[PDB]
Amino acid sequence: EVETFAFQAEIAQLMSLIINTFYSNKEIFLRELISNSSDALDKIRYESLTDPSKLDSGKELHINLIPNKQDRTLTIVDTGIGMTKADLINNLGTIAKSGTKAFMEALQAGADISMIGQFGVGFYSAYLVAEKVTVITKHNDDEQYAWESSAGGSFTVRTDTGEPMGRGTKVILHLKEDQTEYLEERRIKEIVKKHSQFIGYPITLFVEK
Numbered sequence: 001e002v003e004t005f006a007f008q009a010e011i012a013q014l015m016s017l018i019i020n021t022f023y024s025n026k027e028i029f030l031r032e033l034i035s036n037s038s039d040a041l042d043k044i045r046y047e048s049l050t051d052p053s054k055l056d057s058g059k060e061l062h063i064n065l066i067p068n069k070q071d072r073t074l075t076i077v078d079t080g081i082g083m084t085k086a087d088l089i090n091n092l093g094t095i096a097k098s099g100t101k102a103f104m105e106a107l108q109a110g111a112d113i114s115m116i117g118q119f120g121v122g123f124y125s126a127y128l129v130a131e132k133v134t135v136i137t138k139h140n141d142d143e144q145y146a147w148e149s150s151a152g153g154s155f156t157v158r159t160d161t162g163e164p165m166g167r168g169t170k171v172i173l174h175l176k177e178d179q180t181e182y183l184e185e186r187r188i189k190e191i192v193k194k195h196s197q198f199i200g201y202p203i204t205l206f207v208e209k
């Protein structure tokens, strides 16, 4: 049972701008997603300070980067707080309507795409490199869900029968044909060291057979 939803108009507009603007500095997508992961880990860590049982679903607080050249996917896994179904539908837990409004004024007032994270919509920079994005998520207060979108104005939500996650979020980037450099180990390492060197959680770059 798959539910299909239209993006709000302002979010569709943001995604088409990200997809269609000529803009070479695509590597910032990884910085934005890792920072989202760090924010989600901060949240569950804060909750556990007063309620240890919040970590019954998983004590480890980390970020894994998993390239797969056969599937042409880069997956960013974190064990942060996760998202409820309502969170997924409501722009993946963001205030994306007012954030997009601000971002797009900033772009006409000098800024560039790399500044997207300052407006709370950094997730959508995934479409700089991905033709389709799948988000699997598990929050302590809900079941496990899969969100998916290839842009084009709609996204789907379904219950995820896949491998159970415990708690956290998995962003699966189905990369564009000409963006496979972001599956290469030395390129990922360079980007992490350049842009995420002060993230307060271990980031493990998985290797391939």
Ligand SMILES: O=C(NCc1ccc(F)cc1)c1ccc[nH]1
Pocket (backbone or CB within 6 Å): 017, 018, 021, 103, 104, 105, 106, 107, 108, 109, 110, 111, 112, 113, 116
């Ligand atoms: O660059 C501009 N729009 C294109 C754009 C592309 C991606 C993005 F995430 C945000 C905007 C702009 C608008 C106003 C001044 N500059």
